[PDB]
Structures are given as C-alpha cells and as structure tokens.
Amino acid sequence: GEIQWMRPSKEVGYPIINAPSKTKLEPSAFHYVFEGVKEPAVLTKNDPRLKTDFEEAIFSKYVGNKITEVDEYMKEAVDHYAGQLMSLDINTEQMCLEDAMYGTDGLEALDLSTSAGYPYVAMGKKKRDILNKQTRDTKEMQKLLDTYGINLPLVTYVKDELRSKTKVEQGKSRLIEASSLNDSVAMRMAFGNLYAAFHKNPGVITGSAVGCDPDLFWSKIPVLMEEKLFAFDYTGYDASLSPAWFEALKMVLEKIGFGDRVDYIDYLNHSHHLYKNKTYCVKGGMPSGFSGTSIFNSMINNLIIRTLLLKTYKGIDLDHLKMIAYGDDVIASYPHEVDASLLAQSGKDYGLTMTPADKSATFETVTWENVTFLKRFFRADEKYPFLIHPVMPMKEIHESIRWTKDPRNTQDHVRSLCLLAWHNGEEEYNKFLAKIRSVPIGRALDLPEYSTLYDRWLDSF
Ligand code: NA
C-alpha cells in the first residue's frame, strides 16, 4: 500500500471530519489486582507521552508497493485456490438488500455500533436512524443509496485500544478506515452469499476460519492439518498488500461466478480517505479495522502462501497444502517440512514482511505444542483427548481486565474474559476468580465456576 497524495479536504470538496481525541479507556476496578504494562494508544498529535512525530508514525504503515502485475506463480496460486472454492458450490446470486442489512443464515446483521462513515458522520446521522432491527425496513436505506450512491470516501479513525509502552511512545497507533454505510451495504449485497458460504464452512477448503467458534473448532483443526506445520507473522499485513494481490483476488472471484462484481475490489485497492481536515489517495492496502474485509484478507492469504510455495519449491503439491487463515493470521501444514525463513525471503519480493511465528527471534519448527492461532495454543483435554482446548495465556487476559470502556459493561467484559481463561485449567481459573472477588465490583459480578464451564463445554459438542 502507498499513499499517492494527501491534502486539505476542502481543496477537493470535502468537510473536516471530527474524530474524538480522548480515550474511553480508564483504569478498572481491577487495575491494581492484576499485573499489566499496556495503556491506551495515542489518539492525538498532542499527547504528552509521544516521543516522535505522531502523524508520521501512523501513516508509516504504508510501506509501499513491491509489485504491480500478477506473475505466473500468482496465476497458478489463483487457479488452485479458485479450483478448491469451486467444490463448495457457492451460490453466486446477489443478496437482497434486506438480508445484506439485517442478516440471514451465515451472515450477521450490520453492526449498529460502528461508524456509518461518510457522509452520515458529517450530517450527524446515525445508523440507528436508518436501520430497524425489528422492522427490517429497507426504504430509508434504499433512499440513501439512490441519493448518495456508492464508492464514497472511507473515514479514518485512530483505533482506541491498549498498546505496549514502546508503541505508545513511538506513536504507533493503528489507523482504522471505515467504509460508508452505502458501500458496506452494497458490498454485502454483492458478496453476501460468498460471506455466508465461508462462515458456514470454516476449514481447509475455504482456507478460512472467519465466523468460527474456537471452543468447538479447535477440535476439528488437527484432523484437517497435515503432518508438518509451518507458520509466521506478518508486519502490517493489510497496509503492505500491493495492487497485484487485489488483481489476483478478482481473478478468483471471476472464476467462481462473481466476475460480475470485481469492481468492488478496485474500490478497496485504489481508495481515498478522509482524516480530520485532510483527504488522501491510497494505491493498494486493504481498508483496516472492520469485519467487512476479513474474508477478502483470508482469501488473499491463501493466494500468498500458495504463491510463495510455488516460487520457493517448484513441484510442491498444493493439494496437500492444508491451511486456515483468519485475515493475516494463519496456521498451515504440508506433508513435508518447509523453511519458513526461506518463504519469508520470497515474500519480501512480493511486498510482504514475514517474521517468526509468535515474536520468536529466529524461525523455529512449528509443532502442536508451540503453535498458536488467534493467540490460542492447542491443548488436548486431560479427560477426553479428542476434545481440544483453545488456550489463550493469562497475560493478555490480565492486561485487558485492568481497563474499562464502560462501567455498564463490566459484567459482560469480565464474563468474556472468563470464557477465555478457564481453558488454562481449574487451578489458574480459580486464582483468577479469587482475585476478581477481592474487590467490591468483582464480588457483585455473576461469574461461572470452573465446573459449570467444563460441563457447558462438553454439552456444546
Ligand atoms: Na486501498
């Protein structure tokens, strides 16, 4: 991804966009009961904690574009992946406005809490003033589509979240690019059925894990994986995507019956954005921050891995590449051992910056013991080995519980963390609950004991 130009929005006919400057994150009732070192990300250039230019730090995510055209390896990758997707018999019909808006089987309704983007954010018009969950009214939406049309500017927001001390100082906050409600709705109409098909088929055929339930899906993953696992992390995946990867995606869509709407992909690839009093044009880079791009990022990841394998190991048998992606996150496998370090090298030529899986300093062998997917390890249940626990370390959970975005959601926030934590075992889980119950707010919460969560887990299969 590369910013082509940036200039005052008024110069190209746009209003200044107001974006909150204060974090809604504040110490929770457990701030001093659990250990943690993360704080809210810098949201403005005038943050006392900064140590380097802010604006420069947040837009530096666009490292540039290493490639423009789709080479021969990418074409092969495209034919193999498209071929796989073909077996799912995906309904290529456009989805009706109602379902695209309020959801259907395999597609959750449009999120009402997220920004409605341009121009609604400059009209003080909220989604709640357009969508009726209970009415499933499409008249107001339809009127807005006819009025403002599509291909509108995306609104940039700095993501309000916890970040490491170093990242706070270096202004490394994550920029979020929100599509207009009109575009988001239009895209869910064009690809709604593709999305549902992916949500209902998490695994190695879609090569996707979006929409999955870790508590249940972790038991299915090992059976689909090959003999030898391999993985790695990406540095700024979304922003690093070159235009060619978007072209490769269009080819996959064409081959599976959606060549009808590959233009929407151009809208993601070559896009313009609004940030405060500025507007800028980006070549490449997947608009980051929201679920609308999850599937396309996963699809592109399937193309990337295949491409690097073809480029690095001529004669590789892609039919035996078993991988599952969730955006940039990935867990892959092959009957034979591969060199991640080497793949990383080939990746550089394609504009991808790949590093050792889970912040290792060197590329080590990935095993069922050290592999993580969505930050969760895999652990067989001591009583029933065939049931696999998704284990997220307590560290991140402790970091999260030390802050709150709304006292009204303390119950849900903490219950959420409990669903993640009990998998670390009864000993660890009880220590967690006891610490929670060492302060008034915690004792007033209705939280499930270990026994209850274990039984509920077995009863969910
Ligand atoms: Na873009």
Tell me, yes or no, whether 247 and 379 share the same domain. no
User: Are both 250 and 280 inside the same structural domain?
Assistant: yes
Ligand 1: distance of its center to the CA of 101 in Å?
Answer: 24
Task: State in Å: Cα 29 to ligand 1 middle.
Answer: 40
Residue 20 counted as domain residue? no
Does some domain include residue 65?
Answer: no
Number of domains in the chain: 3
Separation CA 82–CA 206 (nearest Å) = 10
Q: Which of 367, 399, 428 is the last residue of a domain?
A: 367
Location of structure tokens 């006392």: 48
State the CATH number of the domain containing residue 426. Answer: 1.20.960.20
How many angstroms does the Cα of residue 334 sit away from the middle of ligand 1? 32
Among residues 276, 280, 279, 272, the alpha carbon closest in space to that of 9 is found at 279
| CA distance readout (Å), 330 to 150, 233, 295, 372 | 32, 8, 13, 9
Indicate whether 160 belongs to any domain. Answer: yes
Handedness of CA 277, 279, 285, 291 (dihedral sign): positive
Distance CA 380, CA 323 (A): 20
In angstroms, the Cα distances linking 236 to 1, 173, 287 are 10, 12, 12
In the block, residue with structure tokens 């026994």: 451
Distance CA 372, CA 369 (A): 9
| CA–centroid distance, residue 333 to ligand 1 (Å) | 30
Q: Which two tokens stand for residue 411?
A: 């119950």
Same-domain status, 155 and 99: yes
Residue carrying structure tokens 């980051």: 288
Domain-embedded: residue 347: yes
> Using N-to-C axis directions, what is the helix angle for 181-200 and 294-312, rounded to 10°?
60
Class of residue 167 by CB neighbours under 10 A (exposed 0-12, middle 13-18, buried 19+): middle
Method of determination?
X-ray
Which tokens is 374 given?
Answer: 């969505």
> Does residue 27 lie in a domain region?
no
Ligand 1 midpoint to CA 133 (Å): 31
Instruction: Tell me, in angstroms, the distance from the centre of ligand 1 to residue 268's CA.
Output: 5
Cα diameter, the chain = 66
* 237 occurs within a structural domain: yes
**CA–CA distance, 196 with 89 (Å, rounded to integer):** 12
Structure token pair of residue 328 = 């940039």
Q: Is 233 annotated as a binding residue?
A: yes
Instruction: Judge whether 1 and 281 are in contact, CB under 8 Å.
Output: no
Is 50 inside any structural domain? no
CA dihedral 191, 196, 199, 202 (to 10 degrees): -90
84 CA distance to ligand 1 middle (Å) = 27
95 and 75 part of one domain: yes
How remote is the CA of residue 451 from the centroid of ligand 1, in Å?
A: 48
Q: Residue 238 annotated as binding? A: no
- Roughly what angle, to the nearest 10 degrees, separates helices 340-348 and 294-312? 110
Same-domain status, 437 and 385 = yes
Cα(262)–Cα(248) distance, integer angstroms: 11
Sign of CA dihedral 87, 89, 90, 93: positive
- Residue 336 belongs to domain spanning: 213-242+292-367
Q: Do 330 and 272 belong together in one domain?
A: no
| 280/305 same-domain check | no
CATH of the domain at 308: 3.30.70.270
d(CA 407, CA 29): 9
Residues 228, 353 within the same domain: yes
Which of these, 371, 308, 316, 310, lies nearest to 343 by C-alpha position?
A: 308
CA distance 261 to 249: 12
3-state secondary structure the chain: CEEEEEEEHHHHCCCCCCCCCCCCCEECCCCCCCCCCCEECCCCCCCCCCCCCHHHHHHCCCCCCCCCCCCHHHHHHHHHHHHHHHCCCCCCCCCCHHHHHHCECCECCCCCCCCCCCCHHHCCCCHHHCCCCCCCCCHHHHHHHHHHCCCCCEEEEECCCEECHHHHHCCCCCEEEECCHHHHHHHHHHHHHHHHHHHHCCECCCCECCCCCHHHHCCCHHHHCCCEEECEEECCHHHHCCHHHHHHHHHHHHHHHHHHHCHHHHHHHEEEEEECCEEEEEECCCCCCCHHHHHHHHHHHHHHHHHHHHHHCCCCCHHHCEEEEECCEEEEEECCCCCHHHHHHHHHCCCCCEEECCCCCCCCCECCCCCCECCEEEEECCCCCCCEEEECCHHHHHHHHCEECCHHHHHHHHHHHHHHHHHHCHHHHHHHHHHHCCCHHHHCCCCCCHHHHHHHHHCCC
Distance CA 101, CA 185 (A): 6
Contact 23, 300 (CB under 8 A): no
> CA–CA separation, 399 vs 380, rounded Å?
26
Helix axes 294-312, 243-253, angle to 10 degrees: 100
User: For residue 370, what are the CA distances in angstroms to 208, 364, 399?
Assistant: 21, 10, 22
Cα-to-centroid distance, 68 and ligand 1 (Å): 14
Q: How far is CA 213 from CA 22, 199, 289, 374, 460, in A?
A: 33, 10, 21, 11, 11
248 CB burial (10 A radius; 0-12, 13-18, 19+): buried
Both tokens of 117, joined, read: 């983007």
Whole-number Å distance, alpha carbon 239 to ligand 1 midpoint, is 8
Contacts of 372 (CB under 8 A, 6+ apart): 357, 358
Q: Which residue is it, tokens 């791009």?
A: 293
Give dist(CA 420, CA 397) in Å, integer: 8
Overall residue count recorded for the chain in this entry: 461
Give distance in angstroms: CA of 324 to centre of ligand 1: 24
Instruction: Compute, in angstroms, the gap from residue 235 CA to the centroid of ligand 1.
Output: 17
**Can you tell me the distance from the alpha carbon of 150 to that of 183, in angstroms, rounded to the nearest whole number?**
5
Centroid of ligand 1 to alpha carbon of 7 (angstroms): 17
Cα separation, 350 vs 328, whole angstroms: 15
Give residue 103 CA to ligand 1 midpoint distance, Å.
26
Measured in Å, residue 71 CA sits from the centre of ligand 1 at 21
The contacts of residue 411 (CB under 8 Å, 6+ apart) are 445, 446
- For residue 152, the CA-to-ligand 1 centroid distance in Å is 13
Candidates 386, 346, 328, 338; CA nearest to 365 is: 338
First-to-last alpha carbon distance for the chain, in angstroms, is 42
Beta bridge partners of 203: 208
The residue among 367, 383, 418 that closes a domain is 367
53 lies in some domain: no
Distance 243 CA to ligand 1 centre (A): 8
Taking the centre of ligand 1 as the mean of its atom positions, its distance from the CA of residue 63, in whole angstroms, is 13
Domain boundary among 347, 367, 387: 367
CB-based contact 94:189 (threshold 8 Å): yes
Based on the domain organization, do 304 and 358 belong to the same domain? yes
Resolution in A for the shown PDB structure? Answer: 2.3
Quote the CA–CA distance of 205 and 325 in Å, as a whole number.
11
**Shared-domain flag, residues 96 and 160:** yes
* 185/268 same-domain check: yes
Cα–ligand 1 centroid distance for 3 (angstroms)? 9
| Amino acid identity, position 168 | V
Domain check: are 279 and 354 in the same one? no
Q: Are 391 and 379 in contact (CB under 8 A)?
A: yes
